[PDB]
Amino acid sequence: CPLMVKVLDAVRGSPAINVAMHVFRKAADDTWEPFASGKTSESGELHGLTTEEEFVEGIYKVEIDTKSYWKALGISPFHEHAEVVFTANDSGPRRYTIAALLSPYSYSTTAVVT
Amino acid sequence: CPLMVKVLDAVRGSPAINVAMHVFRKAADDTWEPFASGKTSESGELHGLTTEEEFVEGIYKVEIDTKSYWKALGISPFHEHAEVVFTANDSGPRRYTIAALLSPYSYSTTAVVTN
Amino acid sequence: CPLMVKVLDAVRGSPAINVAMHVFRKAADDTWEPFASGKTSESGELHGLTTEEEFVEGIYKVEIDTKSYWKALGISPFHEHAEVVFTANDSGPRRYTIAALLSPYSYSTTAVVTN
Amino acid sequence: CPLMVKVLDAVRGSPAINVAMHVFRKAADDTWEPFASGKTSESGELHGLTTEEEFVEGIYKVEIDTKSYWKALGISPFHEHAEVVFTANDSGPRRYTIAALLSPYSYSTTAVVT
Ligand SMILES: COc1cc(/C=C/C(=O)OCCc2ccccc2)ccc1O
Ligand SMILES: COc1cc(/C=C/C(=O)OCCc2ccccc2)ccc1O
Numbered sequence: 001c002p003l004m005v006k007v008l009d010a011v012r013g014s015p016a017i018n019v020a021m022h023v024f025r026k027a028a029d030d031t032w033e034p035f036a037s038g039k040t041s042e043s044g045e046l047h048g049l050t051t052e053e054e055f056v057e058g059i060y061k062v063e064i065d066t067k068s069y070w071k072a073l074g075i076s077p078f079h080e081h082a083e084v085v086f087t088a089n090d091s092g093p094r095r096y097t098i099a100a101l102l103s104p105y106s107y108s109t110t111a112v113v114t
Numbered sequence: 115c116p117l118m119v120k121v122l123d124a125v126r127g128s129p130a131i132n133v134a135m136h137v138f139r140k141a142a143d144d145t146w147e148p149f150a151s152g153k154t155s156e157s158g159e160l161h162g163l164t165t166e167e168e169f170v171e172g173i174y175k176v177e178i179d180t181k182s183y184w185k186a187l188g189i190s191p192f193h194e195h196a197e198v199v200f201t202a203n204d205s206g207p208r209r210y211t212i213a214a215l216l217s218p219y220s221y222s223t224t225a226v227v228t229n
Numbered sequence: 230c231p232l233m234v235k236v237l238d239a240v241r242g243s244p245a246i247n248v249a250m251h252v253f254r255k256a257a258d259d260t261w262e263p264f265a266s267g268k269t270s271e272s273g274e275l276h277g278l279t280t281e282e283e284f285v286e287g288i289y290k291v292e293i294d295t296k297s298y299w300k301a302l303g304i305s306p307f308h309e310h311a312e313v314v315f316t317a318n319d320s321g322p323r324r325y326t327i328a329a330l331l332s333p334y335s336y337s338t339t340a341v342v343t344n
Numbered sequence: 345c346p347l348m349v350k351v352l353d354a355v356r357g358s359p360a361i362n363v364a365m366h367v368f369r370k371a372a373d374d375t376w377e378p379f380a381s382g383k384t385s386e387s388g389e390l391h392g393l394t395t396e397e398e399f400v401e402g403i404y405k406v407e408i409d410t411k412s413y414w415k416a417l418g419i420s421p422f423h424e425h426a427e428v429v430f431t432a433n434d435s436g437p438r439r440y441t442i443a444a445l446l447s448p449y450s451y452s453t454t455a456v457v458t
Contacts, residue, residue: 008443011240013307013334013457059194078225078242080173080199086192099352101454103332105227105242108452110220110445111192113357122328125355127342127422127449192357213237215339217447219357222337224330227242288424307430307455309403314424335454340422342449 015044026059129158140173244273255288359388370403
């Protein structure tokens with residue numbers, strides 16, 4: 001698992017469950033090509049997005065649908081979504097965990113690269 | 115200002131000075147159109163991006179060039195930039211302060227919205 | 230002010246207003262002595278806690294009563310309070326802005342330190 | 345494991361390894377009694393701090409020695425330590441994960457209660 005995402009809910013103190021996200025890879029035409037997607041599990045994690053052979057160097061965008069998450073909970077949110085845009089593997093393949101901590105008017109994102 | 119951005123550096127405990135950013139507004143054809151741009155001052159703040167008349171309802175994207183900031187300090191950061199996307203003025207004019215706190219492998223963004 | 234505190238509410242996207250806090254300074258016998266206290270204004274800021282003369286070198290603790298804040302909004306939060314402990318003025322007088330961002334189960338605190 | 349701590353380093357994008365912390369329980373005399381301690385593993389986690397029988401309702405303080413962590417890396421930090429003070433189990437025993445994300449002049453802490 002070269003790429004994993006973990007989402008936490010700072011209002012309820014819980015994993016953020018059933019949060020949809022899409023991963024895009026930057027194309028030579030400067031556009032974002034669909035690459036992977038899924039929704040977080042009961043533990044707030046999304047695994048199996050890609051494989052090491054497929055996960056080559058490049059620029060990736062993870063677009064997390066936070067707005068739908070807050071709407072499902074009946075809470076008015078600020079952001080349309082949370083985006084994490086990064087260059088992968090510029091040192092060669094390692095492992096990437098992207099964590100996002102969500103509040104209605106704030107989010108934090110951190111990468112753990114190991 | 116109806117729109118102000120403030121950026122802090124969590125490594126040095128200072129305002130993040132001379133950070134470039136670009137604001138876009140989503141057009142009718144779902145394209146991002148350039149709206150405004152600027153750089154943070156010595157206080158880490160960017161004022162005067164827009165006016166109440168020009169800042170109409172819509173979806174806005176603030177793209178903060180955090181990578182160039184970290185690179186100039188000798189640091190290779192994780193993120194290409196920090197992005198903030200939001201619907202503005204949907205229930206009438208508001209004033210928006212977007213705050214960003216920067217670390218090489220992490221950032222947070224908060225909005226303060228006042229009537 | 231050599232010491233100012235700013236508190237934001239990440240649930241409502243607003244300054245956190247009327248948040249109480251107490252500042253302590255570590256004494257020679259390693260006890261926390263009361264130093265100053267106050268509440269945030271409508272802008273979420275607390276100014277005038279101390280003066281340059283009184284704010285000597287030492288270890289300081291800012292105890293922000295986040296629990297009473299959340300309770301008054303009908304929310305049962307995780308933390309009893311948010312604490313910030315730091316050595317101040319160790320290399321001469323500085324100005325310290327402590328920023329706190331509050332959610333019911335999370336908080337962050339940053340320091341901006343300027344000469 | 346009713347109480348677990350996870351620490352991440354936001355400067356290096358890694359688990360914060362060998363971070364010492366002490367857990368205190370509030371005593372009736374208004375003082376903090378030593379309860380548990382340890383240091384984070386290679387994965388930035390500290391497990392086995394307590395057992396469900398021992399982890400009763402009360403006020404707990406986790407004092408994370410962030411200053412020594414930054415000093416070991418040669419980086420000047422702002423905080424003396426990071427403290428997390430909370431009331432446990434006021435709804436009865438659940439599971440507590442305390443996460444802390446560290447920068448030299450900033451820290452964030454979040455609780456995941458499941
Ligand atoms: C630590 O909580 C945060 C607060 C904020 C908001 C910071 C702010 O509004 O500015 C306060 C610090 C400051 C520095 C220089 C001048 C004025 C205020 C942003 C991100 C955060 O994670
Ligand atoms: C508290 O500062 C943060 C930490 C993190 C990292 C959270 C994490 O790595 O997961 C902890 C949640 C968790 C861990 C193990 C078992 C259950 C829940 C993300 C954003 C933050 O602002």
